[PDB]
């Protein structure tokens, strides 16, 4: 089972699933092998009913699609649609939060409110919205209107791009025509240009993809901005992760998906139902996280994270998961059938994401508290039904220090230099105590033993004094393996990094270092890493493609991960991806994405499936940036 | 070659291509066989980097995707993305025309103007825009603003749906949640809901598809509305079709693509360059049409149609095609490589649709006349370079009577009943001289001998007194086979239909009947058929699902054709498709689309690849509607 997952709790549940005959994601993967090589390389097209068209990577015919589409075109069109799909997900999440904010301040949903007034005013100021003499509710209405306006064409470009990157970066992108005109506008233009008989030039297609990836970035940044207004900006928090956070004697409720608009409410209501939970024989309601909705409630409230990504079904295999409350994205639909064998109540809540066989509760912000109580009552009913049933919760968990929003990081550094908080970080980059910054992002993927690339790469970088930040299921992988426990700093960190983590920690009262890796939140909260890197760029007077900052989607899966990787490249970062995207069928497309894009945006993809080699390549990319700044490395 | 195309001119060019060694679409199809059965049935997913996933139609594993996605989910997600892509194309075309109109009336592009003031005011009235006391330019600005506003969420739903269907139909659709909230909003929500780990219920997915198909309808109707304001509403016109419309002694310039914003200008400028063409040794500039941009200029100006769809490369094989001027959609990218062997100058004009190896001219409405002259000068240069080269233009052409906009049809019928123009049509439906109405729409497809299904089905329906209307490449197929020549009415039409076509023709001065089939325009102008059918519905006080009206996408190919077929179903029509969409891998999805959707919208798909059988099925659908109205059949 260590060939399926490096997580010992997951391995234990894989053994239980095997003896109980419950099929898992790894079993379904095995049943899919050998997978189609045309699809894996990108050399398949189904964009019209003359297809499917395939092209042999090598050899004889077919060499070209029926309409004449070349391998270059086919691969670039497929990739562009994946970017658009990812942008559609992140920006659908942001759009939902925009409507939620508008409702809150129009007095239509009093379960929601402006919790972070400081963040509201700073976002308003960034967008050019006047705050002097205005009611907070009016400023917020303007912010939510601006958010909605970035989805369509208007007299300005997408402000959640142009106001969040350095002017010099905006200028470079504008010169190449890459600034998005509107988020849903770009998604639709991708779907148009990639349909049959339209764009058929790889460079032109890929430029469109880069622009659509910035629409994804805008959705991510908008989502983080709106969620912080509504739910609070994260600050350091201490919690736990892995399946041992489930408690046999409690009602275990997982929040799973991406958008916390309902699961933030679940967290609140669950505490006010502690006595109703007790009347049913439980100690309490134990809300736990899965995937990014879990990250959201971890970062804001310290809710423990049960599991992530590819291993999500394992939480149900314990027998102790009374409810799984779903919104959208990255939810394996197998959960609805597994639930019949495990006793879990799987509940969908969003109209555009239902799963056959799950119970649907139509969540409305207007009714959030009532809907939450209905859902938790189902979970309580379920707890009662498992009276007397043995459960097998692996007694395995890690300590997690998290909550490192960009504001939190700036505040932590400000204890070393109150009026120039970024300077202590920069000083330690210059002197080499911090070699550079690496962001780990993205999913797990069944093709890769779970977490093996995140942990292997992170260990090498941390020994070389790289400041490692993480989001999403990359943060999930690292937290489940102890990378967010400060007790592991001596083992994992080089001496320079340890010194910096210790100096900042001790200056923040902790009598101990910051954790080895800083958890910056959910996938949309990759936008927080952008905010940090852009602030560093501003403070140094250079663009992001001169900073010693890299990204790694070390185990990517979702179309959203492709979008994030592409915008990381577009904003100027060397960007590692540790699974193969469907590009190898076209050398010209591969060469653009891994090399000639450098001449457009300064960033580039590093495709490398061997994680030791990827770490070396990421270090070389960091060290090249250091050399370009005239720094030792 | 009659196994490739039923068009004799195409067959002649296929022989020339074969002896010259020029590969065609049919050759590329042959090289693709056998095609992938997983893709053909819909049982392939590439929505995440754990794929590709395939499901065996029958037999053993794989039975489910890696994430747990069932065959039902996989098939419904694929279909929904095709609908979204089609909506993206039709509504990208409409959006372009909206911006063109706005520019025209803001004084930014004086090559464009309000040509149809009556249509402008009627559209304004339909949308609720005041016209009394307003400058036309201000009414138009309001109409273009409204057009742009339908792309995004706002306080009203998409007006180019809710104001163009009967209230009773709007009510049925609203009750099922099917009215789109915004065109690009729906496209993005489809891309989101279909991404990994989101919507996983076939009925829910398909309802989303139906709603997105109405966003496609809105784009089509918007496109026709805006093009009529700018370029004029079609009225009856007489021209010719097929390759014999090329002239060896002239500069032959094909306009090809969909959006006529530039090719309407090409038509104008070409006439003012007749003397510059003569100085170069030509008789003149002979503008000819391909595909739907060709239909647009045929309907408005009588420009002859050279060819359509699958046979587009054959126009180049003649050796006499000096330029091919491209916008977007349905352009085989092979044209750019064929042009090196045929001497044709292939010119792209739109930023989001380039083809490697073609010459790009950046068209701007602000510069339309200048850009057109640059392009035509290239075509003239090309004509000169073929001084002395033999050409082989098949001496094959048909006479085409076209220009039957809905306004034109109403006007024609008004000569039989001035103040109740629809009543003569209804009277003849009731008495059986007109059995019903069939709309032929969509593309040719290399899988089907070109035009064989359109002509086979149309012949059977016309003998059974069906009034046949046609758009797009369905109109192209029928025009190239003589179905738009009134001289063929005696051979093709039943006695009842002949009597009606003759009565209307003779009442319009023609001393002869209307043609056997009425050409209602381009693919967006499927919206004109909706306008006609909705007006009939209004006049009878029933909804469209009670009218004896059917649709047939008899040879479909493009994602746009899937969108049109789906909205034809959604508005209440029995809708034949004569190629297999990728649905047969899921019986539940097939059953929804061909049967249980009847209980939602009253329409349904009829999937039938044998064209004689399809005609019988379409007649049975018409006759069932007649029976439901208590009429003989
Ligand atoms: S778009 Fe071209 S390559 Fe794709 S399926 Fe259609 S014919 Fe084949
Ligand atoms: S979304 Fe599911 S079915 Fe599709 S490729 Fe990914 S794992 Fe396979
Ligand atoms: S041929 Fe396998 S992915 Fe299309
Ligand atoms: S396996 Fe052939 S279309 Fe994917
Ligand atoms: Fe995910
Ligand atoms: Fe993610
Ligand atoms: Fe992910
Ligand atoms: Fe993630
Ligand atoms: Fe994830
Ligand atoms: Fe077409
Ligand atoms: Fe069409
Ligand atoms: Fe078509
Ligand atoms: Fe067509
Ligand atoms: Fe066509």
Task: State the CATH number of the domain containing residue A148.
Answer: 1.20.1270.30
CB-defined site of ligand 1, < 6 Å: A 45-48, 50-51, 53, 65-67, 69, 196
Residues B215 and B240 in one domain: no
CB-defined site of ligand 2, < 6 Å: B 45-48, 50-51, 53, 65-67, 69, 196
Q: What is the three-class DSSP state of B457?
A: helix
Return the beta strands (E) in B382-435 as ranges. 398-402
CA–CA distance, B33 with A62 (Å, rounded to integer):
9
Under 8 Å between Cβ of A481 and A6: yes
What is the helix (H) or strand (E) element at residue B285, kind and residue range?
A: strand B285-290
What is the helix (H) or strand (E) element at residue B209, kind and residue range?
A: helix B202-231
The shortest CB-CB distance from A188 to any of B69, B187, B201 is to B187
Burial track A155-188 (b if 16+ CB lie within 10 A, e otherwise):
eebbbbbbbbbbebbbebbeeeebbbbbbbbbbb
Residues A363 and A414 in one domain: no
Q: How many CB pairs under 8 A join A and B?
A: 321
Q: What is the three-class DSSP state of B551?
A: strand
Residues A480 and A350 in one domain: no
CA–CA distance, A269 with A376 (Å, rounded to integer):
9
Ligand 4 pocket residue status of A36, Cβ below 6 Å? yes
Residue ID of nearest Cα to ligand 2 atom 5: B51
The shares of helix, strand and coil residues in chain B, as percent rounded to the nearest 5, are: 55, 10, 35
Of the listed ligands, the closest to the CA of A333 is 2
Indicate the residue among B336, B368, B403 that finishes a domain. Answer: B403
Residues constituting chain A: 633
Ligand 3 pocket residue status of A39, Cβ below 6 Å? yes
> What's the CATH code of the domain at A255?
3.40.50.2030
| Residue B81: inside a domain | yes
Q: Give the residue among A438, A528, A442 at the shortest CA–CA distance from A220.
A: A528
Q: Give the residue among B300, B277, B275, B278 at the shortest CA–CA distance from B289.
A: B300
The shortest CB-CB distance from A355 to any of B28, B201, B331 is to B201
Q: Report the chain B residue with the minimal C-alpha distance to residue A35.
A: B52
| Residue A10: inside a domain | no
Distance from CA of A562 to the nearest CA of B (A): 9
Under 8 Å between Cβ of B626 and B632: yes
Ligand 4 pocket residue status of B52, Cβ below 6 Å? yes
Return the beta strands (E) in A349-397 as ranges. 359-360
CA–CA distance, A24 with A304 (Å, rounded to integer):
24
3-state secondary structure A19-85: HHCCCCHHHHHHHHCCCCHHHHHCCEECCECCCCEECCCCCCCCCCCCCCCCHHHHHHHHHHHHHHH
What is the helix (H) or strand (E) element at residue B471, kind and residue range?
A: strand B467-471
Indicate the residue among A403, A434, A459 that finishes a domain. Answer: A403
| Residue A495: inside a domain | yes
- Domain membership of residue B267 as a residue range: 235-403
3-state secondary structure B72-117: HHHHHHHHHHHHHHHHHHHHHHHHHHHHHHHHHHCCCCCCCCCCCH
Q: Establish if B154 touches chain A: CB-CB under 8 angstroms.
A: no
| Residue A40: inside a domain | no
Residues A101 and A135 in one domain: yes
Residues A469 and A412 in one domain: yes
| Residue B4: inside a domain | no
Ligand 3 pocket residue status of A66, Cβ below 6 Å? no
* Stated resolution in angstroms: 1.4
CA–CA distance, A70 with A351 (Å, rounded to integer):
39
Ligand 4 pocket residue status of A52, Cβ below 6 Å? yes
Residues of A within 8 A of B176 (CB-CB) are: none
Binding-site positions of A:
36, 44-45, 48, 53, 67, 258, 292, 330, 443, 473, 523
Are A334 and B581 inside 8 Å of each other by CB?
Answer: no
| Residue B476: inside a domain | yes
Are A447 and B333 inside 8 Å of each other by CB?
Answer: no
Q: Judging by beta carbons within 10 Å of its beta carbon (0-12, 13-18, 19+), is residue B8 exposed, middle or buried?
A: middle
Kindly give the number of the ligand 4 atom that is closest to the alpha carbon of B52.
4
Q: Give the residue among A36, A64, A210, A189 at the shortest CA–CA distance from A586.
A: A64
Residues of A within 8 A of B29 (CB-CB) are: 50, 66
- State the total domains in chain B: 3
Instruction: List phi, psi (to 5°) of A340.
Output: -65, -30
Residues 6+ apart with CB under 8 A from B431: none
| Residue A6: inside a domain | no
Residues A382 and A518 in one domain: no
Residues of A within 8 A of B557 (CB-CB) are: 48-50, 196
User: Ligand 6 (ion): which residues have CB within 5 A?
Assistant: A 472, 523
Ligand 4 pocket residue status of A51, Cβ below 6 Å? no
The shortest CB-CB distance from A352 to any of B182, B199, B580 is to B199
CA–CA distance, B188 with B192 (Å, rounded to integer):
6
Per DSSP, what are the bridge partners of residue A384? none
Distance from CA of B90 to the nearest CA of A (A): 8
Residues of B within 8 A of A447 (CB-CB) are: 49-50
Return the beta strands (E) in A455-586 as ranges. 467-471, 517-521, 549-553, 574-577
Q: Establish if B446 touches chain A: CB-CB under 8 angstroms.
A: yes
Residue A369 has a CB neighbour count (10 Å cut-off) of: 14
Residues B349 and B421 in one domain: no
The shortest CB-CB distance from A559 to any of B73, B88, B195 is to B195
A:59-98 residues touching chain B, CB 8 A cutoff:
61-70, 72-73, 78, 81, 84-89, 91-92
Per DSSP, what are the bridge partners of residue A400? A239
Ligand 4 pocket residue status of B51, Cβ below 6 Å? no
Residues of A within 8 A of B72 (CB-CB) are: 356
Q: Judging by beta carbons within 10 Å of its beta carbon (0-12, 13-18, 19+), is residue A274 exposed, middle or buried?
A: middle
Residues B348 and B479 in one domain: no
CA–CA distance, A614 with A471 (Å, rounded to integer):
19
Under 8 Å between Cβ of B590 and B72: no
Per DSSP, what are the bridge partners of residue A54? A44
From ligand 1's centre to the CA of A49, what distance in Å?
8
Residues B217 and B91 in one domain: yes
| Residue B483: inside a domain | yes
Q: Judging by beta carbons within 10 Å of its beta carbon (0-12, 13-18, 19+), is residue B138 exposed, middle or buried?
A: middle
Are B198 and A353 inside 8 Å of each other by CB?
Answer: yes
Q: Judging by beta carbons within 10 Å of its beta carbon (0-12, 13-18, 19+), is residue A583 exposed, middle or buried?
A: buried
Of the listed ligands, the closest to the CA of A329 is 5
Q: Report the chain A residue with the minimal C-alpha distance to residue B357.
A: A201
What is the helix (H) or strand (E) element at residue A264, kind and residue range?
A: helix A260-272
Residues A223 and A355 in one domain: no
Ligand 3 pocket residue status of B52, Cβ below 6 Å? yes
Residues A566 and A439 in one domain: yes
Breaks in chain B, after residue numbers (C to N greater than 2.5 Å): none
Residues A258 and A304 in one domain: yes
Under 8 Å between Cβ of A98 and A127: no
Residue ID of nearest Cα to ligand 1 atom 3: A65
Per DSSP, what are the bridge partners of residue A347? A325, A359
Q: Establish if A311 touches chain B: CB-CB under 8 angstroms.
A: no
Instruction: List phi, psi (to 5°) of B177.
Output: 75, 30
Indicate the residue among A345, A378, A403 that finishes a domain. Answer: A403
Q: Judging by beta carbons within 10 Å of its beta carbon (0-12, 13-18, 19+), is residue B535 exposed, middle or buried?
A: middle
What is the helix (H) or strand (E) element at residue A215, kind and residue range?
A: helix A202-231
């Amino acid at each position: 089972q260590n060939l399926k997952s490096t997580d010992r709790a997951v391995q234990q549940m894989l053994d239980k699933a095997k003896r109980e005959g419950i099929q898992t994601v790894w079993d379904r993967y095995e049943a899919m092998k050998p997978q189609c090589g045309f699809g894996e390389t990108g050399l398949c097209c189904r964009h019209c009913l003359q297809g499917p068209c395939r092209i042999n990577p090598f050899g004889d015919e077919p060499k070209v699609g029926i309409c004449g589409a070349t391998a270059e075109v086919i691969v670039a069109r497929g990739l562009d649609r994946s970017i658009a799909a990812g942008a559609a997900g992140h920006s659908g999440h942001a759009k939902h939060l925009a409507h939620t904010l508008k409702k809150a301040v129009q007095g239509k949903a009093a379960s929601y409110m402006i919790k972070d007034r400081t963040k509201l005013h700073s976002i308003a100021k960034r967008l050019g919205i006047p705050t002097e003499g205005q009611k907070d509710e009016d400023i917020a209405l303007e912010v939510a209107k601006a958010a909605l306006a970035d989805f369509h064409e208007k007299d300005t470009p997408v402000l959640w791009v142009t106001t969040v990157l350095p002017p010099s970066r905006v200028k470079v992108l504008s010169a190449h025509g890459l600034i998005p005109a509107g988020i849903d506008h770009e998604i639709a233009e991708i779907m148009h240009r990639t349909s049959m008989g339209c764009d058929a030039d790889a460079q032109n297609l890929l430029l469109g993809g880069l622009r659509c990836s910035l629409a994804d970035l805008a959705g991510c940044y908008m989502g983080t901005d709106l969620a912080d207004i509504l739910f609070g900006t994260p600050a350091p928090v201490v919690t736990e992760s892995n399946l041992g956070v489930l408690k046999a004697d409690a009602v275990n409720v997982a929040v799973h998906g991406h958008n916390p608009v309902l699961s933030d409410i679940i967290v609140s209501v669950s505490k006010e139902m502690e006595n109703e939970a007790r009347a049913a024989g439980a100690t309490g309601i134990n809300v736990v996280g899965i995937c990014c909705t879990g990250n959201e409630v971890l970062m804001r409230h310290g809710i423990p994270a049960c599991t992530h990504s590819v291993s999500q079904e394992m939480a149900m295999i314990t027998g102790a998961l009374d409810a799984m409350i779903l919104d959208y994205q990255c939810i394996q639909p197998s959960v609805a059938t597994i639930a019949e064998c495990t006793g879990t109540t799987v509940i969908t809540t969003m109209e555009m994401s239902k799963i056959t066989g799950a119970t649907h509760v139509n969540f409305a912000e207007e009714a959030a508290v009532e809907n939450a109580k209905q859902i938790l009552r189902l979970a309580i009913d379920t707890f009662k039904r498992r009276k007397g049933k043995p459960v097998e919760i692996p007694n395995i968990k890690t300590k997690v220090v998290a909550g490192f929003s960009t504001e939190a990081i700036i505040n932590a550094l400000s204890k070393l230099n109150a009026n120039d908080p970024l300077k202590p970080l920069i000083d330690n980059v210059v002197n080499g105590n911090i070699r550079g910054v690496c962001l780990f992002a993205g999913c797990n993927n069944v093709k890769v033993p779970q977490d093996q690339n995140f942990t292997t790469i992170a260990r090498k970088l941390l020994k070389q004094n790289v400041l490692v930040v993480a989001t999403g299921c990359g943060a999930g992988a690292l937290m489940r393996h102890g990378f967010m426990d400060p007790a592991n700093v001596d083992e994992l960190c080089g001496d320079g990094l340890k010194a910096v983590l210790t100096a900042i920690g001790e200056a923040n009262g902790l009598g101990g270092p910051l954790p080895p890796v800083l958890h910056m939140g959910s996938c949309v909260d990759n936008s927080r890493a952008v905010a940090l890197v852009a602030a560093l760029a501003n403070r140094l007077g250079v663009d992001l493609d001169r900073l010693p900052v890299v990204a790694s989607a070390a185990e990517a899966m979702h179309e959203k991960a492709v979008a994030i990787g592409t915008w990381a490249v577009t904003i100027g970062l060397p960007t590692h991806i540790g699974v193969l995207p469907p590009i190898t069928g076209s050398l010209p497309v591969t060469q653009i994405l891994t090399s000639s894009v450098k001449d457009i945006t300064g960033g580039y993809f590093i495709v490398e499936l061997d994680p030791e080699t990827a770490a070396d390549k990421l270090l070389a990319a960091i060290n090249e940036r250091r050399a370009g700044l005239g720094l030792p490395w």
